[PDB]
Amino acid sequence: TSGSIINHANNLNKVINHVFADKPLISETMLKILTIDGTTGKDGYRNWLDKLVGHNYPVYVEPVVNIMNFISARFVADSSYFGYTNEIMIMPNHINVPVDDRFGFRDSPFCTSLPRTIMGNDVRRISYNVFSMMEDIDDVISEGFILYDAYFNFSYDIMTTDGVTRLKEDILIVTDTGNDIKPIHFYIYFENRNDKKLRYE
Amino acid sequence: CMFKQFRIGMTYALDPNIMDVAAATCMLLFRPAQSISDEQYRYCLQTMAVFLTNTTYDIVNNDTIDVLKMKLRNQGWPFVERYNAVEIDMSVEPLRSPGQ
Amino acid sequence: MDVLSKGSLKELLAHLEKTPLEEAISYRIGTVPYQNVLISRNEYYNQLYPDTTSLIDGVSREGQRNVNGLIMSIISYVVSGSGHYIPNIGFMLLRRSILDILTKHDTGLVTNNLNYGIIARNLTVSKMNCEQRKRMLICFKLLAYKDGNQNDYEIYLNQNIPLKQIAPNFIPGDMRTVIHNQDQLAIVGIPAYRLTQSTELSIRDDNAKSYKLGYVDWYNSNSFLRERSEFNLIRL
Amino acid sequence: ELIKVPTIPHNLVLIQSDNGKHALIKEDLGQWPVETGISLVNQAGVFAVQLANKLGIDKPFVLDAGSNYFT
Amino acid sequence: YPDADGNDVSIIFSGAMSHAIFTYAQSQWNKNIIKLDDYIREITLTVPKQ
Amino acid sequence: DVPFVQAYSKFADDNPRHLRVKTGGKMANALTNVIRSYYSINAPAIVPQV
Amino acid sequence: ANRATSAFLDNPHPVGVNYVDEGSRQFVAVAELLASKLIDSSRESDESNSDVPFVQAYSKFADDNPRHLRVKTGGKMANALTNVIRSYYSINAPAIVPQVEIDRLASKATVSGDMYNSYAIFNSVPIVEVLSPARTTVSIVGSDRADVTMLNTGAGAANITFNFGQIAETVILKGSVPFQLARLNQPMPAARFTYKLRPLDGPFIVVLPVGNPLVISATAATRIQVPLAFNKALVESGFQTAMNDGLFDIQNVNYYSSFDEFIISQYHAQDGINRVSTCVILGLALQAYDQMRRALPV
Amino acid sequence: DVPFVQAYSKFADDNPRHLRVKTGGKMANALTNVIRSYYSINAPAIVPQV
Amino acid sequence: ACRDKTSANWRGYSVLVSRYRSLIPNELFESLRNISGEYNINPQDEHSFFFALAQINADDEFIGAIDKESAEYLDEYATLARDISNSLTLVKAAFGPLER
């Protein structure tokens, strides 16, 4: 199919350009072999890569392969260690959600696990692409939902003093060409239970 | 390649040189067999026989394709056949038009 | 369209406060329900397609003038978008909103001596989905609490285990239960991507699909047409 | 060559409130942006080499922390 | 005088042929003048589903 | 197929579909059922007002 | 006169009337597609000595990463797939899963919910009634291959009336010994081993001579419109698993040996064309259920 | 529908029109009649060698 | 040398033929199926073509899998189709039947 040939040609050129940029991946000894006929170094490597597609050659697994593979598995498995998560929850203030209370945070934004049910009913889950195209978002956010099917980058700053736990920016931005979630930055404060001013705020 | 109805032809000299054979074998290898006609195929076989085998055009006239193939194979020339081209299945995305 | 679009208990109850009983009932005679009929579905079969007419089809059907007929018409409006034909209800009840009929004593209507099992059977509760079942139970609870029949509501739920699982979690007299409720009750709504303009086999399924497809156009082109009629008029 | 690593990368901080009631131990491995719509494993491989560089485990090494002690 | 749908109707003394040609031209251009909402509906049918 | 696609799209609110018999869509379904209803009272009323 | 009928055709219980709309049908098609990828990814994981392909497939199906300590149930999609199967079987099922869950799961993949673009052949033999005179004993055994055993103790030959319904397309009728069979108001032909019959053209009469019993084997084929992704091998396996797992344990229902018996019994009700579409959707759900449970046993 | 239109073009040597029912063209016609010829001697066997 | 140049540079020419085909509307392509012809190439030109076979990159033309220039060029034929019908009808109405 013409689509497969075009896709293969474009991807192959991107690989060759990236491989030969900065310090080349291939030593000068292999370039000398592939340029014996007269073709340039970039062209000689390009034809060899095309031939190797579909090879059954066994390749030995070096130690640095395993180290990178181990780290990559932990990157996907434990996402919260590296500052990203797979789902977020937006709820109104008046709805009481169970949250983590071990760290003594005032209005802690963390939960042990996102609630399966709130007030006896399962929390609605909406994918990000569907949420972006929603024009009735004002009605939806009244009840509360869970955004998923996306990777959310977040950062938090734990403040030693006591204050209102709030986000740096607004939660969402509503435009004509879709909706979006603004960058997430938390200002988490430790809690004094008897401060009436900070409780009312 | 786009249109099957189009054809490729050649005209060689009365006494072919090494370039005429080189041109003839490059066509039979890297051009569609549907583009080279039967009459052009015989002429390409004749110009190869005149050079590789010690013969002239008048002698190899009235010679069928099979006889010319036998003459060249005995001399040691294996490029005596046409090669068909594979058909690449193409689609054009619709956009505003229906698509092709 | 507007009633089926509401997706929260707050929005549904707010809509019923602003909607007169005239919208619940209809002035078209329709046909008698509970009839085995053959309808035409040429999308799929050459032969006629059997089905049974019901009160929740979305098409006006004849109903009696007793208390049960009025309640059944209201519930059909909530779950199917169209009510039944009750002859000569009277101007006194038509001006009242749906919620006052359900949850007030000033309407002059005696809604006691009501059997929820009989009403549920007539409305074909076995054929309605989770959202339609939830809406029906909301009407039942409002009627039960107004007449002091909370025990009969609990007895009905005990006999019907599937309805007890999806029972609404609000108490009619308490406002805190209404605001914190997280039920989803939206039969129709604007969908991501789109839905094919194709027919369905059942009367209920096809009529429901016709509401979903027309909601998008109704959403965009209703404000001006309603305003033209609303201007220079007094509400009922 | 075979490099020798003197110290262990604990990567730990201690955060405590002013009044002292609450404290926690946080491990800071950095922030890594992730782009949606494309394969996550391919992005993980790029970040894996940078993570190994931060921990000093990319090149062959042998740990010598035996002399890091007092009595 | 105003029409039922808000249009303005002018009654004047004019020719039979000039009136026939002018008003026929108006009716031909008018059937191609449609509301924005109807135009969006037609556009949505041409573009893909999403 | 250009003239037919335009007329079918206006009639059925959907374009003609390959590997799918074209029957007329919802307009055909509504027209067929009201014809049945016109003949006899015993025939049901199925098409909604919307 | 004595009447004999097939066991699997007696009292077909009403099927559910929920989750048959376009949105729900797209959910079932998505479930089958994602279940197939789950099986394929596990095979690729075994071959390549890496769990990366399986992690991606499980993440899309269950919306969560696999964990060594936790169990692989399949997520919310597994719960929804089990619940819809329960609702399809009987109208007394709870049908609890909400619409917002159905729509959110149909949006994972882009597959049409068309259930009429292909067909499948179901080899179940519908024998509505076999009318028999006095002194003649008729027994019907089997569904895939129906063996009818008849013998007469009377003095003269008897006439046995066969009714195969109006749904089956062709019925091939083989006897142990040559026998004569003809339609109503038609001459009887010479005795022959096999007969090919269209069930539509009226009841059939078989002449039963006095003596040794005559055993007649019946085979029928019926074409029912089904989706392209339908697979009878997978559907039948899913039917057994769901029955083993108690998904069909609902009061006041009938039980069937295989899926083809279920679909033909519901086809032969008073208005059977209503239930065929619901039964077909149930078959595709069972195909998805079989693939998911084999990848994620519990 | 591009992959199906492309595959049907190889099978039937024609690009289908919307109204005309798709059945396979000459390949379907030849295959169906050859199947009949295999079953019995009495079959017509009316498929040309070209 | 001809085979090595052919194998290295066949992807660019396969893509090039696709891009040229995408510039032709369906109506125009069907008409060109009726015509036929044969091209005559000098033997020196053919051998020099395969020997000195340039490489066609065509990488910056595609944005992902979409070729903007080809997509936009196909679209202007729809404007041409509108003009052809508009002009033809206006001349027919203005002039009517023509007699010489």
> DSSP string covering A101-131, please?
-SS-BTT----SS--SEETTEEPEEEEHHHH
Give me the residue from I7, I14, I55 closest to A5, CB to CB.
I14
The experimental method, as deposited, was: cryo-EM
Which DSSP helix (H) or strand (E) runs through I87?
Answer: helix I68-95
**Minimal-distance CA residue of chain C relative to G272:** C50
Q: How far apart are the CA of G51 and the nearest CA of chain D, in angstroms? A: 12
Q: Hey, is the C-beta of G119 within 8 angstroms of any chain C C-beta?
A: no
Strand-pairing partners, residue G161, are G131, G205
Shortest Cα distance, chain A CAs vs residue C217, angstroms: 13
Chains I and G touch, using 3 or more CB pairs below 8 Å: no
Smallest CA–CA distance, residue C204 to chain G, in Å, is 10
- Interface contact A83, partner D, CB < 8 A: yes
Supply the DSSP string of H5-33, one letter for each residue: HHHHHHHHSSPPPSSSPP--HHHHHHHHH
Distance in angstroms (rounded) separating the CA atoms of residues G130 and G214: 14
Read off φ and ψ for residue I98, nearest 5 degrees: -110, 130
Q: Nearest by CB to G17, which of C36, C127, C130?
A: C127
The arrangement of strands across the sheet holding A124-127 comes to A88-90, A145-148, A124-127
Q: Which residues of E touch C220 (CB under 8 A)?
A: 37, 40
User: Taking CB atoms and an 8 Å limit, are B90 and A5 in contact across chains?
Assistant: no
The vertex-G267 CA angle with G265 and G272, nearest 5°, equals 125
Structure tokens at C162: 């599937």
The secondary structure of D32-60 as a DSSP string is: ----TTS-HHHHHHHHHHHHHHHHT-SS-
State the Cα angle at I92 between I88 and I94, rounded to 5°.
115
Mutate to test the interface with A, among C182, C185, C219, C220 (most CBs of A within 10 A): C182
* CA distance to D41, G25, G217, per residue, from G84 (Å): 34, 11, 38
Q: Cβ contact (<8 Å) for C192 and A129?
A: yes
- Positive or negative, the CA dihedral E49, F4, F7, F11 is negative
Cβ-based burial of A50 (10 A; exposed 0-12, middle 13-18, buried ≥19): middle
Amino acid at G176: S
Mutation target among A2, A7, A8 for the B interface, most CBs of B within 10 A: A2
CB under 8 Å to A53, separation ≥6 — which residues?
none
User: What SS3 string covers chain G?
Assistant: CEEECCHHHCCCCCCCCCCCCHHHHHHHHHHHHHHHHHHHHHHHHHHHCCCHHHHHHHHHHHCCCCCCCCCCCCCHHHHHHHHHHHHHHCCCCCCCCCHHHHHHHHCCCCCCCCCCCEEEEECCCCCCEEEECCCEEEEEECCCCEEEEEEECCCCCEEEEEECCCCCCEEEEEEEEEECEEECCCCCCCCEEEEEECCCCCCEEEEECCCCCEEEEEEEEEEEEECCCCCHHHHHHHHHHHHHCCCCCCCCCCCCCCHHHHHHHHHCCCCCHHHHHHHHHHHHHHHHHHHHHHHCCC
Partner-chain residue, chosen from F13, F26, F48, that has the shortest CB–CB distance to C82: F48
Pick the residue from chain A with its C-alpha nearest to D47: A72
Q: Cβ neighbours of residue D68 under 8 Å, at least 6 residues apart?
A: D6, D7
The alpha carbon torsion through A31, A37, A42, A47 (nearest 10 deg) reads -100
Q: Which of A5, A37, A43 sits opposite I15 (nearest CB)?
A: A5
User: Is C211 within 8 Å of F25 when comparing Cβ atoms?
Assistant: no
What chain C residue is nearest to A131 in terms of C-alpha separation?
Answer: C192
Looking at chain A, list the stretches that DSSP marks H as alpha helix, in order from N- to C-terminal side: 2-19, 28-34, 41-52, 63-77, 128-132, 137-143, 196-200
H2 touches chain B (CB under 8 A): yes
CB contact under 8 A, C220 and E37: yes
G52 touching chain D per CB within 8 A? yes
I62: chain A residues, CB-CB within 8 Å: 6, 10
Contact in structure between A158 and D15 (CB atoms under 8 Å): yes
Compute the distance between CA of residue A93 and CA of residue C140 in angstroms, rounded to an integer.
Answer: 31
> Do residues G87 and G18 touch, judged by C-beta distance below 8 A?
yes
| Cβ contact, residue pair H6, B91, below 8 Å | yes
H-chain CB neighbours of B98 within 8 Å are none
Resolution value, angstrom units: 4.8
Q: Does C91 touch chain E (CB under 8 A)?
A: no
End-to-end alpha carbon distance in chain E? 47
Q: Which chains touch E (3 or more CB pairs under 8 A)?
A: C, F
How far does the CA of residue I33 sit from the closest CA of chain B (Å)?
7
- β-sheet with A152-159: strand ranges across: A84-85, A152-159, A184-189, A166-167
Check C40 against F12: CB less than 8 A apart.
Answer: no
Q: What residues form DSSP beta bridges with G221?
A: G170
Q: Decide if I65 and A3 are in contact by the 8 Å CB cutoff.
A: yes
Residue D51, phi-psi category: left (phi > 0), alpha (psi -120 to 50), beta (remainder): alpha
Q: Which of D15, D22, D47 sits opposite A75 (nearest CB)?
A: D47
Do you know the residue count of chain E? 50
Q: What is the DSSP string of F6-34?
A: HHHHHHHSS---TTS----HHHHHHHHHH
CA of F7 vs chain E CAs: smallest distance (Å): 13
Subunit contact B99:H6, Cβ cutoff 8 A: no
G17 touches chain D (CB under 8 A): no
Residues A60-79 as b/e (b if ≥16 CB within 10 A, e otherwise) read eeeeeeebbbebbbebbeeb
